[PDB]
Amino acid sequence: IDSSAASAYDTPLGITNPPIDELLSRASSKYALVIYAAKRARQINDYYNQLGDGILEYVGPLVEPGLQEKPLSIALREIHGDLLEHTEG
Amino acid sequence: NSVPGAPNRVSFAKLREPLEVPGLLDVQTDSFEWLVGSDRWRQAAIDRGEENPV
Amino acid sequence: EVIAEHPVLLNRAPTLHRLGIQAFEPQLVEGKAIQLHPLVCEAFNADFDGDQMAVHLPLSAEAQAEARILMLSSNNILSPASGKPLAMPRLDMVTGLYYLTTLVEGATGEYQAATKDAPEQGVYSSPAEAIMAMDRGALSVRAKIKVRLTELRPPTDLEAQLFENGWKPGDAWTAETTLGRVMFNELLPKSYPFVNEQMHKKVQARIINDLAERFPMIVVAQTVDKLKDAGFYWATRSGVTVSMADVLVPPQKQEILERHEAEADAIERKYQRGALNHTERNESLVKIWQDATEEVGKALEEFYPADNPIITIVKSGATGNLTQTRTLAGMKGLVTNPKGEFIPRPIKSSFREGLTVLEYFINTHGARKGLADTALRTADSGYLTRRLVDVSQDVIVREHDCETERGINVTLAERGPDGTLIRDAHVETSAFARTLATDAVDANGNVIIERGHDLGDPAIDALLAAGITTVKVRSVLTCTSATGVCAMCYGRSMATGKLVDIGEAVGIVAAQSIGEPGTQLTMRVGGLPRVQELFEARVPRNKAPIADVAGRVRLEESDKFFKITIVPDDGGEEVVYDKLSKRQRLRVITHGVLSDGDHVEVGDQLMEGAADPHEVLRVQGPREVQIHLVKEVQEVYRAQGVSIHDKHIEVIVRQMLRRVTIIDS
Amino acid sequence: MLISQRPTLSEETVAENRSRFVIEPLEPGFGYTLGNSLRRTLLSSIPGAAVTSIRIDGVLHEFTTVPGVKEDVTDIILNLKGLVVSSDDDEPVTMYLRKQGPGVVTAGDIVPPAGVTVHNPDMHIATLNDKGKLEVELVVERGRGYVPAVQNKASGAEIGRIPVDSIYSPVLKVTYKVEATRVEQRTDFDKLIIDVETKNSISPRDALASAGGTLVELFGLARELNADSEHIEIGP
Amino acid sequence: LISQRPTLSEETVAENRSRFVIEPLEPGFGYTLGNSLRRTLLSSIPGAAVTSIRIDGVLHEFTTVPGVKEDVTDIILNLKGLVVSSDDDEPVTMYLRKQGPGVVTAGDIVPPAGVTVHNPDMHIATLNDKGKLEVELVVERGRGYVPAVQNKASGAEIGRIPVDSIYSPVLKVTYKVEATRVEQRTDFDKLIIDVETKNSISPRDALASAGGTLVELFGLARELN
Amino acid sequence: LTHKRRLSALGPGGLSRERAGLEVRDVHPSHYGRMCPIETPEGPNIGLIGSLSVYARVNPFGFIETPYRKVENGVVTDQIDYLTADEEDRHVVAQANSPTDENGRFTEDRVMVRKKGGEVEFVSADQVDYMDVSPRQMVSVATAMIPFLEHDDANRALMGANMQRQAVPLVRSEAPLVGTGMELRAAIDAGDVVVADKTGVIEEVSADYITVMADDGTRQSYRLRKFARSNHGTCANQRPIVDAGQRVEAGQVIADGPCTQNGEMALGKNLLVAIMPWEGHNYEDAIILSNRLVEEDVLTSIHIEEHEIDARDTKLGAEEITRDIPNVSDEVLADLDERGIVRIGAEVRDGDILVGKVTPKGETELTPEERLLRAIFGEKAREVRDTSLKVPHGESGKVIGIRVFSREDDDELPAGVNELVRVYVAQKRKISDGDKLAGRHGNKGVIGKILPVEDMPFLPDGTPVDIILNTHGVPRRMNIGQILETHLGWVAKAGWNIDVAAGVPDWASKLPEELYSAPADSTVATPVFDGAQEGELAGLLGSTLPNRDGEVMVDADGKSTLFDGRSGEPFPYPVTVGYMYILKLHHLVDDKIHARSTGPYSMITQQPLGGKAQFGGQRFGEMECWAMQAYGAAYTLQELLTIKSDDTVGRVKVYEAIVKGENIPEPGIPESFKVLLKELQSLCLNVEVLSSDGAAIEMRDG
Amino acid sequence: WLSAASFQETTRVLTDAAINCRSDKLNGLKENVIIGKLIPAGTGISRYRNIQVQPTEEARAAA
Ligand SMILES: [Zn+2]
């Protein structure tokens, strides 16, 4: 059905790789999405900069990262994959 | 024509010029030579009608 | 490695609205100049004649997330002021999309009906065959043909007659169109129905608005990129060039000029005989030469062919006017004095023929006056924008719904000739993007649209079809929220197209939306000074007193002033007014001089001009003064063809009616 | 001279008969020449067979509708122009298509003579009505490219002939695009992307090979003036 | 269907001009062949040009030589119009040296064995009774346009003056089609391409080099399947 | 030349650019022949600055006079009277274009005149008592060099004059094919050209001196400026145009100037132009250039920069110029001579040392780590600080001159200064993307693409075009004069021969007899308000002579059939082609590009400086803050305000976090707020920050 | 008083505020911009600043 499959686009390029509409459907608003992605990226960055010999608490990237992929891109990919949950204040 | 050594540039003008373009830097030189009081300024003032130029 | 997926913010001063700062993904280039996308210029108001831009680099994770989501250029395509798309084909692109989609009669290899000896000629089994035929010079992209399409949706009308269930990809149908329209519809999404129209700029804007309303924004961005590429490709093959031979002059210009010059000579001779004033002669000459200008313009417009390179640019909506075309080839017309007054002697020579010395001198008069006025207008607009921003900044969406039954009455249709209910010309900025406060009920009461429904074009169509002329919407003027406003009262956000998010600064957006079209607000009291005196709650320069009570009207005449006495309809102390300027006119009462013996209303205006909003507030009420302020501001802004939704004006007016004076502490 | 780096060609299947070849890296400015020459050669160089004219029984003077079948003359012509067919002879040959009674006259009902074969026997042509007939005579020739409908070569000796446009080229649609790449701090090299869709009688790779062979023949004819001149050597 | 293969023929217009005719060709095919040949001729024909000069008493480009009417910049601009032919890949050095009044032209440059100058009448400089000119030029080979290479890259001295080098020996290439070839159908093209060079190489050699480059490219296009 | 002829309304005893309304910035009808109504700045000084007209003089009382020819009984005499505005108002002045007979009698009865209050009117031939001298009496020198001025709108003519004043000198100059005749006089009166004083013959001509004999028996020696820096960085060198033995006359031009060819003003180059859209690379006033311009150094200019450094006397000691430079490598000091200055001809890059200076440092307590490192490596710490003169950021070139002044050699240096040295660095700049080109008709634009030669559209002869200009920008700006110039330009670089067979053609009735035939590359003159007409232009387009192949490339309409460079197929429609004279303006990307990550800061408020010359930052003003607030981007705005401008600890913490790879820390308190609080307290205002409890928060952290 | 002083008529506003002994509450766009705090709009409101992000139980177990 054309109406059912109306979300048929070409392959997104670069900074638009996770479609913004799907991410907006994942979250409540756009600001909630912004804070969601920023906090997940901070958690990933802290995981990468972990001492290793101390205490491990922050979970690593739940999806397989690229070669030199930014933590924010990984956070957005995790959000798009329904691998995280958030609660607003 | 007036300039001794000039390249040939044909013109589309159809009107004769009764008066040629004056010196384009006279607005400064004439004023300063009036200020100093040079001889040529004195002669120009005398030939234009003068009483006692200063 | 380090710049990959790291957005940067680009800004061009002055920053008039939000779209003056936009986030982009950078790519290294070998030059020293920033390469900017051609479709983001209108948002930046940028042209490539020496402009410069500033680049800023976000650092923290929150900053990069905001740059990617909130401020990305691919997410901001619609204006936050009117909702019209800004990242749409303009200038060269339009020309291409025009030349591609126009239909030419008698072109090469066009469709021909079957004869008694030969079958139909010009029918192709696929667009690939049409392309293979046009590559051999046997076909034109602007020739009508019949082509079998299998990957393009029927235009919503043939689909309901050919495919009973529906159209699925691969189903073949025969379309009578041009190859250019087939290519253009190949640019559009697959589920979008076939258009089959010539792409004027209005048509392209309508299509892009439809895509934005019906499709995800990523699809809209990709479609806009495809349209840009196709328009750029077909603009260079459109054959639009400027030549002295393409600037044609009408052959009957001399006759019109001679006749009007004979009339002018007759008027001048009559003036020399003493039977004329100076003002009368000036007015007669101005009228004569204006009529001559109109005649020359009409003759030029009718003389030019439809495929002229000069006419094509104007007609396609790319850029330009017909007045500029008339000035280029035709008659310059009447010019103004240095103090703003028409000169009786016109400029009868066009810039193609070449102005003379004195005509050029007068043209310099007018041109320098305009150039010098532009800078002052820009400075005044900037000051007004700063004041508006500094006023409405505590107006922020704090809740979702204040649960209020109070609203604003908005009119959709006024009378209708015999009951057709002709739609109001200003319903897109008065009734769209608003939520109904009460259920719509017509004669033989039946709920058409329920409470809380976001009004759109289908909703307005349904309401008009049901015979409903007025509705009650929710506005920020009547909102019972403690701090800030709520999302339901503000309504749809003109940028996203959905309900406004909680926590958005709508005051800053409203102030910027009002203040951005200030440079193009030419004064004709009117223009920018009228807006400034409306927003400052000042008494008007040409103040027109309004009636204080309704009833009998008594007129008293004298020298240098008039006098109006309002005898109460039910008795009481008759209201007496004061001296009035003679260089003004009384209000026209329908068919119209207000001599005497009239029954004025409670707040009926008497003279012609502007009434001070303070008297409107004191006599009638806060709702009436809100209506007056919004209507006056919109009247000023609509004289220049500027579309601003009423919600911004309503926010600003709401911030002006927040206080009461204490008299009995 | 020696090129900085040898160009490479890679295929990318998109459909049953559709491919997207990529050639990279290319010296700056060679992408456009290569792409345009390859596109023109693919579209107008490969020989092939196609239906040249048709003759429908029962339709002699008025070419509007055919009795006994739902489709009209135009629909039959459009269906027949989509018939892919390979041939062995060069001179024109005649084929027959006879159907009796109601039913769908698919392309498989055509009886192929010696040396002629069809590759899409499941192509819909017409739908006869109850107690209906259809006898169509086709003329198949061999050529290259796309030639418009040649008018009747007689003053009325044969009147039932219906000339049609001949799609001789096995390749249906070619589009070339040139992008920019980078090798080593040199972001000016060109990359050529050719999207080619052909019929089912040939594969896009074979079409590309034939086009390359013909272009090599042409430019070797140009080169034969001086075979020992100084040109750019690609390498291995 | 035509079984006749295309053929190429040559006619001579001048000493450095020629006109080549290719026929028959398929309809709509002459323009693309002509454009491919024109682009290859204007882009990828190897040649020789000077890459550096060193004058006796000067240290940089922005100076003047005593007794010479033209400063160093004008001398370089004049030298950039030389047409030179070298048969050696590695750089070679030519010497120019004149004294006293006269007109220093390109005919006063004595080149080594294997290097030739094809215009020994172009104007380089003019010297009075007190003017002496002594320069040495470095001639290399290449193709296309290469901007000057600075001395900080090759580690040269201060007196060396790098010069932009244009190695392309082709002046002007154009083409036209006739679409008049007839065998049984009257819609077959005929390409006519006019080539004019800088007298360094004959137009036949330039056309052969372009054909070789295009053969290599379109052969790698088909062999890698 | 225009600077010396400028009339300014600003200064002591004059108006100010803010206290001046829309009353003095107007073209008064009394400016005719005294002040140019076209040439004025288009910025905030519009109407407050102007230029003298060509024929305008100055009264002894300070009023501006203009000449007029006195006419009597309809006969125009040869007596010229200089009148001011007051004297002009009393009389009625005719127009210089009025048709006159052989004696001066007006052939036509009705004459266009100007009455008292401007009042352009028609009167009889007997009322006239004065006439103008030339049709271009109202225009200035810059405005008189625009061909087809009457076909351009006032705004575009203003822009054209202003941009024509901004051209840069190229390495080689070329006079325009189509001009106005105000090129010899402007160049000669400018003074940058060298003019012989007395008639005679040339004896010795060189690149830097010319010796001229005379009939009197006196030798005149002229020294020519060679590669001399002007006030704005351009190169101003003169070259002789005479030969030994040539006999010159008093007043004849003897050596050209920077923008001068054969004594005529030459500010730009003649380029083959095609008027057409092209793939969007010339979208929105952009320009596409051919690569032949870069290869052949057509639009190439020399720019000279001067760097000066002085070694003075300080209180802690004396400053010495030497090649010691305590803490550097050894290869940095390779281009410096024995006295510590660079060598002439040595190429310098960004950051290279030009003059090696050093200053006394005094006693400073070194860090223990630095002391240990110096002990390990043996580098003794010397009490001198390196203050060498280094090439600024984004600059390079070649050293062409060194000037040294020393007090010990009796040089009039200022007090305290002991030594001074100046270094001149010269750079040749080619045309590139982002450079601004313009024309004489107000058409400007930055180069957006430089295509190869084989990608440009070419004529059927094979000649590529040099520049592509967009079509959509011409009609809506009312400056179609350029188009006419384009057509005329082609004829100028084509030669023409009017077929006088069967009599003179009707359209060529008023053409002078010397314009009936011209050779190739000939130059023509089109005076401002009296020049070529449209009918004559069409006739000359139809009468052009063929090329070397005997064929015509441009038809009578001024259009040609161009081919596509990158496709080969001819364009479906003919395209307007011709020759246009374009100018390279002094707005180059090399002087515009600037970027910074961290640099110098201010003193009172710890905010970054501003300007390219100081490695400053970009201002994020109040409007940008409004845009960020409307977007809803709280964090971006907060970080921009705090940790990029004022947070003193935050800046270094952010840099350390970025380098080490951790997260960006939270912002602190901007220093400007604390400065504001101190400034408020100094006004006897008790400003105090209160916490949630109600106490006072001290701002003395540290 | 901070926004009023930043807007226009600084001296009069400061005099009136000093005499009245006014106390700014520091909740608005202009004041928060001046002092360096997050503006109370967009992503700077309490609802969006206090988002708690954590992996879901299924993703936690899978990883
Ligand atoms: Zn509400």
From Swiss-Prot, chain A:
**Catalytic reaction equation(s):** RNA(n) + a ribonucleoside 5'-triphosphate = RNA(n+1) + diphosphate
| EC number(s) per entry | 2.7.7.6
GO biological process terms held by the UniProt record: DNA-templated transcription
Query: What UniProt keywords apply to this chain's record, in alphabetical order?
Result: DNA-directed RNA polymerase, Nucleotidyltransferase, Transcription, Transferase
Listed GO CC annotations: DNA-directed RNA polymerase complex
Family as reported in the entry's similarity comment:
Belongs to the RNA polymerase subunit omega family.
How this chain assembles, per its entry, is: The RNAP catalytic core consists of 2 alpha, 1 beta, 1 beta' and 1 omega subunit. When a sigma factor is associated with the core the holoenzyme is formed, which can initiate transcription.
What name does UniProt use for this protein? DNA-directed RNA polymerase subunit omega
Organism from which the protein derives: Mycolicibacterium smegmatis (strain ATCC 700084 / mc(2)155) (Mycobacterium smegmatis)
Q: What gene, per UniProt, encodes this protein? A: rpoZ
Curated annotation (Swiss-Prot), chain C:
**GO biological process: one example:** DNA-templated transcription
* GO terms assigned for molecular function: DNA binding; DNA-directed RNA polymerase activity; magnesium ion binding; zinc ion binding
State its Enzyme Commission number(s).
2.7.7.6
Question: What's in the keyword line of the UniProt record?
Answer: DNA-directed RNA polymerase, Magnesium, Metal-binding, Nucleotidyltransferase, Transcription, Transferase, Zinc
Give me the reactions it catalyses. Answer: RNA(n) + a ribonucleoside 5'-triphosphate = RNA(n+1) + diphosphate
Task of the protein: DNA-dependent RNA polymerase catalyzes the transcription of DNA into RNA using the four ribonucleoside triphosphates as substrates.
Which family does the entry's similarity section mention?
Answer: Belongs to the RNA polymerase beta' chain family.
Name of the protein this chain belongs to: DNA-directed RNA polymerase subunit beta'
Specify the species: Mycolicibacterium smegmatis (strain ATCC 700084 / mc(2)155) (Mycobacterium smegmatis)
Quote the range of the complete protein represented.
489 to 1171 of 1317
From Swiss-Prot, chain E:
Keyword terms, alphabetized: DNA-directed RNA polymerase, Nucleotidyltransferase, Transcription, Transferase
Enzyme nomenclature, EC number: 2.7.7.6
Region Alpha N-terminal domain (alpha-NTD): start and end of each range? Answer: 1-225
* Top-level taxon of origin: Bacteria
Instruction: Kindly list the cysteine pairs connected by disulfide bridges.
Output: none
Membrane-traversing stretches: none
Reaction catalysed by this enzyme: RNA(n) + a ribonucleoside 5'-triphosphate = RNA(n+1) + diphosphate
Q: Name one GO cellular component term.
A: DNA-directed RNA polymerase complex
Q: Which GO terms describe its molecular function?
A: DNA binding; DNA-directed RNA polymerase activity; protein dimerization activity
The kind of enzyme this is, by top-level EC class, is transferase
Q: Name one GO biological process term.
A: DNA-templated transcription
The answer to whether keyword Transcription applies is yes
What does the UniProt record say this protein does? DNA-dependent RNA polymerase catalyzes the transcription of DNA into RNA using the four ribonucleoside triphosphates as substrates.
Instruction: Report quaternary structure and partners.
Output: Homodimer. The RNAP catalytic core consists of 2 alpha, 1 beta, 1 beta' and 1 omega subunit. When a sigma factor is associated with the core the holoenzyme is formed, which can initiate transcription.
Give the protein family: Belongs to the RNA polymerase alpha chain family.
Per the record, the domain comment is: The N-terminal domain is essential for RNAP assembly and basal transcription, whereas the C-terminal domain is involved in interaction with transcriptional regulators and with upstream promoter elements.
Q: What is this protein called?
A: DNA-directed RNA polymerase subunit alpha
Q: Which gene encodes it?
A: rpoA
UniProtKB/Swiss-Prot annotation, chain F:
Q: What broad class of enzyme is this? A: transferase
Q: What is the effect of changing residue 10 to P?
A: Rifampicin (Rif) resistant
**Keywords linked to the UniProt accession:** Antibiotic resistance, DNA-directed RNA polymerase, Nucleotidyltransferase, Transcription, Transferase
Q: Which GO terms describe its molecular function?
A: DNA binding; DNA-directed RNA polymerase activity; ribonucleoside binding
Q: Is Transcription there in the keyword field?
A: yes
Tell me which stretches of the chain form a coiled coil: none
- Cellular component per GO? DNA-directed RNA polymerase complex
The Enzyme Commission number assigned here is 2.7.7.6
Q: Which domain of life is it from?
A: Bacteria
Q: Which reaction does it catalyse?
A: RNA(n) + a ribonucleoside 5'-triphosphate = RNA(n+1) + diphosphate
Record has Nucleotidyltransferase as a keyword: yes
List the GO biological process terms: DNA-templated transcription; response to antibiotic
Assembly state and interactors? The RNAP catalytic core consists of 2 alpha, 1 beta, 1 beta' and 1 omega subunit. When a sigma factor is associated with the core the holoenzyme is formed, which can initiate transcription. Interacts with RbpA, which partially restores Rif-inhibited transcription.
Role of this protein = DNA-dependent RNA polymerase catalyzes the transcription of DNA into RNA using the four ribonucleoside triphosphates as substrates. This subunit often mutates to generate rifampicin (Rif) resistance. Interaction with RbpA partially restores Rif-inhibited transcription; once the subunit is Rif-resistant however RbpA no longer stimulates transcription.
Q: What else is known?
A: Mutations in the RRDR sequence (residues 423-449) confer rifampicin (Rif) resistance. Rif blocks transcription initiation but not elongation.
Q: Give the family from UniProt.
A: Belongs to the RNA polymerase beta chain family.
What name has this protein been given in UniProt?
A: DNA-directed RNA polymerase subunit beta
